[PDB]
Amino acid sequence: MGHHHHHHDIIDVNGITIDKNAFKVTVNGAEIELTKTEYDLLYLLAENKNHVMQREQILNHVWGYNSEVETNVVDVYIRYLRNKLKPYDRDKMIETVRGVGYVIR
């Protein structure tokens, strides 16, 4: 009785705990509510924490499912992510890479 990776592959990156099966995000036990897009954004960054996520790479995974939007939309939504991560000081986790994308340091 403790933790299980099966049935619910949870991601733990720099204080963040993403529930993939419950679609909930936690830090410090606090439950953050993300959207279909914003959850996909954070999850993408979290799982690929050590990988610099190009805007279009994010754009292609999150928006890649019938959206037809400019990849700069990603930057915009990431900014909103920061806002929601502010109370948890997790906004700093998303490092901006000008011309490339975003990454979790």
Parent domain of 82? 6-105
Within 1-105, residue ranges assigned H as helices are 36-47, 55-62, 72-85
Q: How many domains does the chain have?
A: 1
Q: Is residue 1 part of a domain?
A: no
**How many Cβ atoms from other residues are within 10 Å of residue 77's Cβ?**
20
Closest CA to 74 of 100, 47, 46, 92: 100
Asked if 28 and 16 count as a contact pair (C-beta separation under 8 A), the reply is: no
69 φ, ψ (degrees, to nearest 5): -125, 155
CB distance 25 to 16 below 8 Å: yes
Q: How many CB atoms lie within 10 A of CB 9?
A: 12
Distance from C-alpha of 4 to C-alpha of 47, rounded to nearest angstrom: 17
- Resolved by: NMR
- Is 25 inside any structural domain? yes
Would residue 28 count as lying in a domain?
A: yes
Judged on CB neighbours under 10 Å (0-12, 13-18, 19+), 1 is exposed
> Would you say residue 77 lies in a domain?
yes
